[PDB]
């Protein structure tokens, strides 16, 4: 449908191995969006093309306030272009370095927004797996928007024991939500190591601890989420229904 000459590219927004995302405006519509620029070269090279066209599938057909819209795509010679919704307030990653830590009411809200987001996804039998702050965008309202659906069906920090030990995986996303929740509160993930190999162990053995300032209800919720056994992990409903969530989730 589209072409590059339909757009006026703007300030660069992001980097990464495959290329960059830029601000851009659609010529005749004046519409503002984001253009992901991926090199055909590197997509083939790094044997991923299949992943790319799966991201295209899933993230297109999806619709939800807490999921980055994907309006479509197009390619040329050197590259493929993903026409993405644009998110004014950037990544959660950035707001985390900037603040280093989050409060309970910000954390809780994010957790909700995230829960609901994944509710909709699970309902459509799609799982993310790559839910890390580098992947969470903020809308104008300051609201969470899950981007990026490459790995939707490397940094182990976000990956649950089953995935990591290479097993039957169905609940993963709830482990991550646990992880995410801990990261928001403490300022780094609960499984952070210095090496790939150590992290693996730390995760495999579910070794994590709570700095003093982490309130009891938070621990509870996180603890419940970070169970080694997939089956023992709450359902999103319970997470939404948790007393520390509801107590705190401004939204
Ligand atoms: C900083 C500030 C705003 C941003 N929006 C985006 C973005 C990426 C895809 N859609 N919107 N990245 C940003 C980085």
Q: Do both 85 and 97 map to the same domain?
A: no
Ligand 1 binding pocket includes 21 (Cβ within 6 Å): yes
Asked if residue 219 lies in contact with residue 86, where contact means CB atoms within 8 angstroms, the answer is no
* Structural determination approach: X-ray
Scanning the structure block, which residue is given the tokens 């990026």? 148
Domain end position, chosen among 90, 120, 148: 90
Reported as half-sphere exposure (CB side, CA atoms, 13 A), residue 10 has a value of 14
Domain end position, chosen among 32, 65, 90: 90
> What's the gap in Å between 212 CA and the centre of ligand 1?
34
Q: Do both 124 and 175 map to the same domain?
A: yes
Question: Which range marks the domain in which residue 12 is found?
Answer: 2-90
Closest residue CA from atom 1 of ligand 1: 90
Q: Do both 49 and 119 map to the same domain?
A: no
Q: Do both 71 and 136 map to the same domain?
A: no
> What's the gap in Å between 160 CA and the centre of ligand 1?
28
User: Three-class SS string for the chain?
Assistant: CCCHHHEEEEEEEECCCCEEEEEEEECCCCCEEEEEEEEHHHHHHCCCHHHHHHHHHHHHHCCCCCECCEEEEEECCCEEEEEECCCCCCEHHHHHHHHCCCCHHHHHHHHHHHHHHHHHHHCCCCCCCCCCHHHEEECCCCCEEECCCCCCCCCHHHCCHHHHCCCCCCCHHHHHHHHHHHHHHHCCCCCCCCCHHHHHHHHHCCCCCCCCCCCHHHHHHHHHHCCCCHHHCCCHHHHHCCHHHHHHCCC
Q: Do both 173 and 184 map to the same domain?
A: yes
Residue 133 sits at φ, ψ, to 5 deg, of -55, -30
Tell me how far the alpha carbon of residue 40 is from its chain's centroid: 24
How do 144-146 and 136-138 pair as beta strands? antiparallel
Q: Which long-range contacts (CB under 8 A, 24 or more apart) does 196-200 make?
A: 196/156, 199/156, 199/157, 200/156, 200/164
The set of residues, in sequence order, having a beta carbon less than 8 Å from that of 91 and lying 6+ positions away, is: 133, 134, 135, 136, 137, 138
Q: Write the CATH number for 49.
A: 3.30.200.20
The DSSP bridge partners found for residue 72 are: 83
Asked if residue 81 lies in contact with residue 3, where contact means CB atoms within 8 angstroms, the answer is no
Breaks (C-N over 2.5 A) in the chain follow: 153, 170
Scanning the structure block, which residue is given the tokens 């992943």? 51
Asked if residue 32 lies in contact with residue 83, where contact means CB atoms within 8 angstroms, the answer is no
Ligand 1 binding pocket includes 90 (Cβ within 6 Å): yes
d(CA 27, CA 14): 22
Domain count within the chain: 2
Domain end position, chosen among 65, 90, 115: 90
Q: Do both 133 and 234 map to the same domain?
A: yes
The set of residues, in sequence order, having a beta carbon less than 8 Å from that of 97 and lying 6+ positions away, is: none
Q: Do both 47 and 112 map to the same domain?
A: no
Q: Do both 154 and 100 map to the same domain?
A: yes
Tokens of 108: 């809780």
Q: Do both 101 and 70 map to the same domain?
A: no
Active-site amino acid positions? 130
Asked if residue 187 lies in contact with residue 101, where contact means CB atoms within 8 angstroms, the answer is yes
Residue 58 sits at φ, ψ, to 5 deg, of -70, -40
């Amino acid at each position: 449908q589209w072409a590059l000459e339909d757009f006026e590219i703007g300030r660069p927004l992001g980097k990464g191995k495959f290329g960059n995302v830029y601000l851009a405006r659609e010529k005749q519509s004046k519409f503002i969006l984001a253009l992901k620029v991926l090199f055909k070269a590197q997509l083939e090279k790094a044997g991923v093309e299949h992943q790319l066209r799966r991201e295209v599938e899933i993230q297109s057909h999806l619709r939800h306030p807490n999921i980055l819209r994907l309006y479509g795509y197009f390619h040329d010679a050197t590259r493929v272009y993903l026409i993405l919704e644009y998110a004014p307030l950037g990544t959660v990653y950035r707001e985390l370095q900037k603040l280093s830590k989050f409060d309970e009411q910000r954390t809780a809200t994010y957790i909700t927004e995230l829960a609901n987001a994944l509710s909709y996804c699970h309902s459509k039998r799609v799982i993310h797996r790559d839910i890390k702050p580098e992947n969470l965008l903020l809308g104008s309202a300051g609201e969470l928007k899950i981007a990026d659906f490459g790995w939707s069906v490397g940094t182990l920090d976000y990956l649950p024991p089953e995935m990591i030990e290479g097993r039957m995986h169905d609940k993963v996303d709830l482990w991550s939500l646990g992880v995410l929740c801990y990261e928001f509160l403490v300022g780094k993930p609960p499984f952070e190591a210095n090496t790939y190999q150590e992290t693996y162990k730390r995760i495999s053995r579910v070794e994590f601890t709570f700095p003093d300032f982490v309130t009891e209800g938070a621990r509870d919720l996180i603890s419940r989420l970070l169970k080694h056994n997939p089956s023992q992990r709450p359902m999103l409903r319970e997470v939404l229904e948790h007393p520390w969530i509801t107590a705190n989730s401004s939204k």
